[PDB]
């Protein structure tokens, strides 16, 4: 069965969703769909250490399990911006915030909701990992907010970082059997399109096999990207 069936959309709902975080603290559910696995754990660090690479303020789209969060805390930072649609996952960022080093700022809503109220260029580093909230934005969802907000809220010289895990586990099963090739030919297009330049657009390409039973993600590598603002 497919995450998502044709004409499926979620955003409506995925706010007031319950968020179902399971006991052993390896999983996060909401609507049924895999969000978030600790396997991903040394992929999310990279993720981190890119957007949290020019220290200052990093803002991080998506909290999940505090994964990335907790990586992004580790690195020398001034502001800790965190934006978060669903209420469960928010509660998580409430009781988490307090105790961190690095002061936090928590925002609850929908990016494509609360983007437009952040100062433009004031972000030295960002980091966007949500999850798609429908079946047609499966493979784009990451490229509406990279047009309209990763460009403008970034400093001259700030670092972009981002993944789509549901869309590249995909496109790594039969399109593409080399991942700097798949990032190369589905997503520099739009990057180069939200106004950031090809010398500026870097990838590291890390080992880590996920589990034998991830339907979702299967190929050996991840790709980090990291591209820059001019
Ligand atoms: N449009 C949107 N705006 C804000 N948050 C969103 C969103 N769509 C999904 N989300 C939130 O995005 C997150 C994706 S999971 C992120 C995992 C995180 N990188 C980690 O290391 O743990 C979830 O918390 C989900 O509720």
Known sequence: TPIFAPGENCSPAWGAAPAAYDAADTHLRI???????????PYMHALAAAASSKGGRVLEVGFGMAIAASK??????????????????????????????????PLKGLWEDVAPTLPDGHFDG???????????????????????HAFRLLKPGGVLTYCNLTS????????????????????????????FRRENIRTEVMALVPPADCRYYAFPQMITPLVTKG
């Open 31 to 41: 609507l049924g769909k895999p969000v978030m696995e600790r396997w991903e754990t």
């Open 72 to 105: 992004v805390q580790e690195a020398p930072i001034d502001e800790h911006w965190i934006i978060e649609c669903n209420d469960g996952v928010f509660q998580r960022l409430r009781d988490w915030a307090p105790r961190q080093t690095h002061k936090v700022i």
């Open 126 to 148: 960002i980091l966007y990992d949500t999850y798609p909230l429908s079946e047609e934005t499966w493979h784009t969802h990451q490229f509406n907010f990279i047009k309209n």
């Open 168 to 195: 590249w586990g995909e496109l790594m099963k039969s399109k593409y059997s080399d991942i700097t090739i798949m990032f190369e030919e589905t997503q520099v297009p739009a990057l180069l399109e939200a106004g």
